[PDB]
Write an enzyme that holds these catalytic residues in place. Structure first.
Site, PDB file in Angstrom:
ATOM      1  N   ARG A  46     -30.668 -16.176  22.690  1.00  0.00           N
ATOM      2  CA  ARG A  46     -29.490 -17.008  22.543  1.00  0.00           C
ATOM      3  C   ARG A  46     -29.055 -17.385  23.962  1.00  0.00           C
ATOM      4  O   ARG A  46     -28.400 -16.590  24.657  1.00  0.00           O
ATOM      5  CB  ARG A  46     -28.394 -16.184  21.854  1.00  0.00           C
ATOM      6  N   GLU A  74     -32.252 -21.040   5.014  1.00  0.00           N
ATOM      7  CA  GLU A  74     -32.513 -20.298   6.281  1.00  0.00           C
ATOM      8  C   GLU A  74     -33.073 -18.932   5.935  1.00  0.00           C
ATOM      9  O   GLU A  74     -33.865 -18.464   6.766  1.00  0.00           O
ATOM     10  CB  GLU A  74     -31.195 -20.375   7.026  1.00  0.00           C
ATOM     11  N   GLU A  78     -36.381 -18.346   8.122  1.00  0.00           N
ATOM     12  CA  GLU A  78     -36.335 -17.315   9.156  1.00  0.00           C
ATOM     13  C   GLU A  78     -37.171 -16.110   8.781  1.00  0.00           C
ATOM     14  O   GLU A  78     -37.616 -15.404   9.699  1.00  0.00           O
ATOM     15  CB  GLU A  78     -34.854 -16.887   9.403  1.00  0.00           C
ATOM     16  N   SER A  94     -13.777 -18.295  15.197  1.00  0.00           N
ATOM     17  CA  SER A  94     -12.856 -18.138  16.328  1.00  0.00           C
ATOM     18  C   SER A  94     -11.864 -19.292  16.274  1.00  0.00           C
ATOM     19  O   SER A  94     -11.980 -20.275  16.997  1.00  0.00           O
ATOM     20  CB  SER A  94     -13.607 -18.107  17.669  1.00  0.00           C
ATOM     21  N   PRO A  95     -10.890 -19.211  15.362  1.00  0.00           N
ATOM     22  CA  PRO A  95     -10.064 -20.375  15.036  1.00  0.00           C
ATOM     23  C   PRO A  95      -9.061 -20.733  16.112  1.00  0.00           C
ATOM     24  O   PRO A  95      -8.406 -21.780  15.968  1.00  0.00           O
ATOM     25  CB  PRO A  95      -9.384 -20.002  13.729  1.00  0.00           C
ATOM     26  N   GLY A  96      -8.965 -19.958  17.202  1.00  0.00           N
ATOM     27  CA  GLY A  96      -8.188 -20.399  18.355  1.00  0.00           C
ATOM     28  C   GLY A  96      -8.824 -21.540  19.137  1.00  0.00           C
ATOM     29  O   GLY A  96      -8.104 -22.169  19.910  1.00  0.00           O
ATOM     30  N   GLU A 117     -40.002 -20.294  11.243  1.00  0.00           N
ATOM     31  CA  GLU A 117     -39.406 -19.918  12.529  1.00  0.00           C
ATOM     32  C   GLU A 117     -40.024 -18.670  13.189  1.00  0.00           C
ATOM     33  O   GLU A 117     -39.362 -18.048  14.055  1.00  0.00           O
ATOM     34  CB  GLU A 117     -37.907 -19.617  12.372  1.00  0.00           C
ATOM     35  N   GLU A 119     -42.247 -17.700  15.472  1.00  0.00           N
ATOM     36  CA  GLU A 119     -42.359 -17.469  16.899  1.00  0.00           C
ATOM     37  C   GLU A 119     -40.961 -17.194  17.461  1.00  0.00           C
ATOM     38  O   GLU A 119     -40.722 -16.310  18.311  1.00  0.00           O
ATOM     39  CB  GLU A 119     -43.044 -18.648  17.586  1.00  0.00           C
TER      40      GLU A 119
HETATM   41  N1  LIG Z   1     -26.201 -24.399  21.524  1.00  0.00           N
HETATM   42  C1  LIG Z   1     -27.043 -25.323  20.986  1.00  0.00           C
HETATM   43  N2  LIG Z   1     -27.106 -26.592  21.458  1.00  0.00           N
HETATM   44  C2  LIG Z   1     -27.867 -27.525  20.887  1.00  0.00           C
HETATM   45  N3  LIG Z   1     -28.662 -27.335  19.846  1.00  0.00           N
HETATM   46  C3  LIG Z   1     -28.718 -26.044  19.379  1.00  0.00           C
HETATM   47  C4  LIG Z   1     -27.976 -24.954  19.940  1.00  0.00           C
HETATM   48  N4  LIG Z   1     -28.246 -23.775  19.210  1.00  0.00           N
HETATM   49  C5  LIG Z   1     -29.097 -24.194  18.263  1.00  0.00           C
HETATM   50  N5  LIG Z   1     -29.434 -25.481  18.408  1.00  0.00           N
HETATM   51  C6  LIG Z   1     -30.295 -26.303  17.524  1.00  0.00           C
HETATM   52  O1  LIG Z   1     -29.433 -26.600  16.410  1.00  0.00           O
HETATM   53  C7  LIG Z   1     -30.022 -26.200  15.229  1.00  0.00           C
HETATM   54  C8  LIG Z   1     -29.284 -24.848  15.068  1.00  0.00           C
HETATM   55  O2  LIG Z   1     -29.681 -24.404  13.906  1.00  0.00           O
HETATM   56  P1  LIG Z   1     -29.963 -23.109  13.028  1.00  0.00           P
HETATM   57  O3  LIG Z   1     -31.129 -22.372  13.427  1.00  0.00           O
HETATM   58  O4  LIG Z   1     -29.645 -23.620  11.685  1.00  0.00           O
HETATM   59  O5  LIG Z   1     -28.687 -22.209  13.328  1.00  0.00           O
HETATM   60  P2  LIG Z   1     -28.406 -21.007  14.361  1.00  0.00           P
HETATM   61  O6  LIG Z   1     -29.086 -19.756  13.947  1.00  0.00           O
HETATM   62  O7  LIG Z   1     -28.559 -21.506  15.725  1.00  0.00           O
HETATM   63  O8  LIG Z   1     -26.868 -20.841  14.098  1.00  0.00           O
HETATM   64  C9  LIG Z   1     -26.324 -20.177  12.913  1.00  0.00           C
HETATM   65  C10 LIG Z   1     -25.078 -19.453  13.273  1.00  0.00           C
HETATM   66  O9  LIG Z   1     -25.440 -18.210  13.989  1.00  0.00           O
HETATM   67  C11 LIG Z   1     -24.822 -18.155  15.254  1.00  0.00           C
HETATM   68  O10 LIG Z   1     -23.604 -17.389  15.174  1.00  0.00           O
HETATM   69  C12 LIG Z   1     -24.547 -19.572  15.589  1.00  0.00           C
HETATM   70  O11 LIG Z   1     -23.594 -19.910  16.563  1.00  0.00           O
HETATM   71  C13 LIG Z   1     -24.173 -20.171  14.224  1.00  0.00           C
HETATM   72  O12 LIG Z   1     -22.792 -19.815  13.929  1.00  0.00           O
HETATM   73  C14 LIG Z   1     -31.487 -25.995  15.537  1.00  0.00           C
HETATM   74  O13 LIG Z   1     -32.124 -27.302  15.523  1.00  0.00           O
HETATM   75  C15 LIG Z   1     -31.452 -25.495  16.969  1.00  0.00           C
HETATM   76  O14 LIG Z   1     -32.602 -25.784  17.709  1.00  0.00           O
HETATM   77  N1  LIG Z   2      -7.645 -24.115  21.910  1.00  0.00           N
HETATM   78  C1  LIG Z   2      -6.802 -23.874  22.951  1.00  0.00           C
HETATM   79  N2  LIG Z   2      -6.739 -24.700  24.025  1.00  0.00           N
HETATM   80  C2  LIG Z   2      -5.979 -24.429  25.085  1.00  0.00           C
HETATM   81  N3  LIG Z   2      -5.184 -23.379  25.211  1.00  0.00           N
HETATM   82  C3  LIG Z   2      -5.127 -22.551  24.115  1.00  0.00           C
HETATM   83  C4  LIG Z   2      -5.869 -22.765  22.908  1.00  0.00           C
HETATM   84  N4  LIG Z   2      -5.600 -21.720  21.997  1.00  0.00           N
HETATM   85  C5  LIG Z   2      -4.749 -20.939  22.678  1.00  0.00           C
HETATM   86  N5  LIG Z   2      -4.411 -21.458  23.864  1.00  0.00           N
HETATM   87  C6  LIG Z   2      -3.550 -20.856  24.910  1.00  0.00           C
HETATM   88  O1  LIG Z   2      -4.412 -19.879  25.523  1.00  0.00           O
HETATM   89  C7  LIG Z   2      -3.823 -18.633  25.490  1.00  0.00           C
HETATM   90  C8  LIG Z   2      -4.561 -18.080  24.246  1.00  0.00           C
HETATM   91  O2  LIG Z   2      -4.164 -16.839  24.165  1.00  0.00           O
HETATM   92  P1  LIG Z   2      -3.882 -15.617  23.187  1.00  0.00           P
HETATM   93  O3  LIG Z   2      -2.716 -15.780  22.365  1.00  0.00           O
HETATM   94  O4  LIG Z   2      -4.200 -14.484  24.071  1.00  0.00           O
HETATM   95  O5  LIG Z   2      -5.158 -15.637  22.238  1.00  0.00           O
HETATM   96  P2  LIG Z   2      -5.438 -16.270  20.785  1.00  0.00           P
HETATM   97  O6  LIG Z   2      -4.759 -15.505  19.712  1.00  0.00           O
HETATM   98  O7  LIG Z   2      -5.286 -17.720  20.859  1.00  0.00           O
HETATM   99  O8  LIG Z   2      -6.977 -15.969  20.703  1.00  0.00           O
HETATM  100  C9  LIG Z   2      -7.520 -14.641  20.420  1.00  0.00           C
HETATM  101  C10 LIG Z   2      -8.767 -14.771  19.621  1.00  0.00           C
HETATM  102  O9  LIG Z   2      -8.405 -15.088  18.222  1.00  0.00           O
HETATM  103  C11 LIG Z   2      -9.023 -16.280  17.796  1.00  0.00           C
HETATM  104  O10 LIG Z   2     -10.241 -15.977  17.088  1.00  0.00           O
HETATM  105  C12 LIG Z   2      -9.297 -17.019  19.051  1.00  0.00           C
HETATM  106  O11 LIG Z   2     -10.251 -18.049  19.086  1.00  0.00           O
HETATM  107  C13 LIG Z   2      -9.671 -15.892  20.026  1.00  0.00           C
HETATM  108  O12 LIG Z   2     -11.053 -15.504  19.773  1.00  0.00           O
HETATM  109  C14 LIG Z   2      -2.359 -18.867  25.203  1.00  0.00           C
HETATM  110  O13 LIG Z   2      -1.722 -19.240  26.456  1.00  0.00           O
HETATM  111  C15 LIG Z   2      -2.394 -20.087  24.303  1.00  0.00           C
HETATM  112  O14 LIG Z   2      -1.243 -20.880  24.360  1.00  0.00           O
END
Ligand SMILES: Nc1ncnc2c1ncn2[C@@H]1O[C@H](COP(=O)(O)OP(=O)(O)OC[C@H]2O[C@H](O)[C@H](O)[C@@H]2O)[C@@H](O)[C@H]1O
Ligand SMILES: Nc1ncnc2c1ncn2[C@@H]1O[C@H](COP(=O)(O)OP(=O)(O)OC[C@H]2O[C@H](O)[C@H](O)[C@@H]2O)[C@@H](O)[C@H]1O
Lengths: 158, 158
Positions: A46, A74, A78, A94-96, A117, A119
């Site tokens: 990754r 998949e 896979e 990660s909805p932040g 997949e 290889e």
């Molecule tokens: N960062 C990337 N940038 C561009 N293309 C990408 C990237 N990563 C994969 N590809 C291409 O995009 C497609 C990715 O496809 P699939 O294999 O269905 O998924 P997964 O296992 O990657 O991701 C599944 C989840 O597991 C993880 O938590 C991930 O973040 C996801 O949440 C393929 O054509 C890749 O070559």
């Molecule tokens: N998308 C954003 N863009 C810019 N600033 C941001 C955003 N979101 C928050 N801020 C600012 O950035 C700081 C965010 O801070 P904290 O409150 O410590 O975290 P959390 O609860 O957001 O995220 C915790 C996790 O929960 C979720 O899964 C998230 O994706 C993370 O994985 C603050 O100043 C925000 O105003």
């Protein structure tokens, strides 16, 4: 509520919404499968993290597919397996900052439908107890999907 | 292996590494806390998803902090509580595109240290069984942290 787009990509878009940085991402699926006490993990390099975490079979939902269909695909691409799939639950990764949503299924009654997949993807059958012990000992990292699989097993499949 | 940067932001960077789109993101923490059978959930509006999923107290690790310290801080800032914290495990939220890593703690022996993030964050004490039932009935969405809390409870805290 409006978004302005900084980047429109292959697997994500980057937008600003007010002061918020937002990554739009396709939805995903993941499949929990247990056989003889072992869970079906996979590993692949990754580039985002520079290592191969322990995951479960997972992938993106492609155009034309619903979550169930993507999960079946998949699992077969896979691991070469098919099974009877049951929807369990979904979560936002990660909805932040991103809208990526993962839909998790259980697979039972597995059957090998493709020999190979291969290889790219390493299939790692492992007891979930051992996966968690290796992680606690610093030996492997988890993805969210891998950790969810291990916890779901301990909660409901023993 | 080299990265070229398209965007350097507040809570993320966007880079390309070869053909890969990569979002660098600060590490995070999350805290699982149980009291009288209820888990400590929180909700807040999340512009990335346009809704308030069920989460557990969570936040970003700030400069100068380790995970434990960040966990103590966001438990206090989000809920006004302190507790005895134990490290459980970590996970990469979505290692196919981001390097965000979340470190999860258990909090016990909770105490209110601040009466009162109160406007922004809703504290939702709820039985984990009920959280999972509401989710299965389509009533609430989970974040990864919320789902991990619910599964960990069912696996180990009953
Ligand atoms: N960062 C990337 N940038 C561009 N293309 C990408 C990237 N990563 C994969 N590809 C291409 O995009 C497609 C990715 O496809 P699939 O294999 O269905 O998924 P997964 O296992 O990657 O991701 C599944 C989840 O597991 C993880 O938590 C991930 O973040 C996801 O949440 C393929 O054509 C890749 O070559
Ligand atoms: N998308 C954003 N863009 C810019 N600033 C941001 C955003 N979101 C928050 N801020 C600012 O950035 C700081 C965010 O801070 P904290 O409150 O410590 O975290 P959390 O609860 O957001 O995220 C915790 C996790 O929960 C979720 O899964 C998230 O994706 C993370 O994985 C603050 O100043 C925000 O105003």
């Amino acid at each position: 509520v409006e978004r302005t787009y900084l980047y429109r990509g292959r697997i994500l878009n980057l937008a600003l919404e007010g002061r918020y940085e937002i990554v739009e991402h396709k939805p995903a699926v993941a499949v929990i499968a247990l056989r003889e006490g072992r869970m079906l993990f996979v590993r692949q390099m990754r580039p985002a993290v520079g290592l191969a975490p322990l995951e479960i079979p997972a992938g993106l939902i492609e155009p034309g597919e619903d979550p169930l269909e993507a999960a079946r695909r998949e699992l077969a691409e896979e691991t070469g397996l098919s099974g009877d799939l049951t929807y369990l639950f979904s979560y936002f990764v990660s909805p932040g900052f991103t809208d990526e949503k993962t839909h998790v299924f259980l697979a039972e009654n597995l059957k090998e439908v493709e020999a190979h997949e291969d290889e790219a993807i390493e299939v790692v059958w492992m007891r979930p107890e051992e996966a968690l012990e290796r992680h606690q000992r610093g030996e492997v990292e988890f993805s969210a999907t891998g950790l969810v699989g291990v916890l779901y097993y301990h909660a409901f499949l023993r």
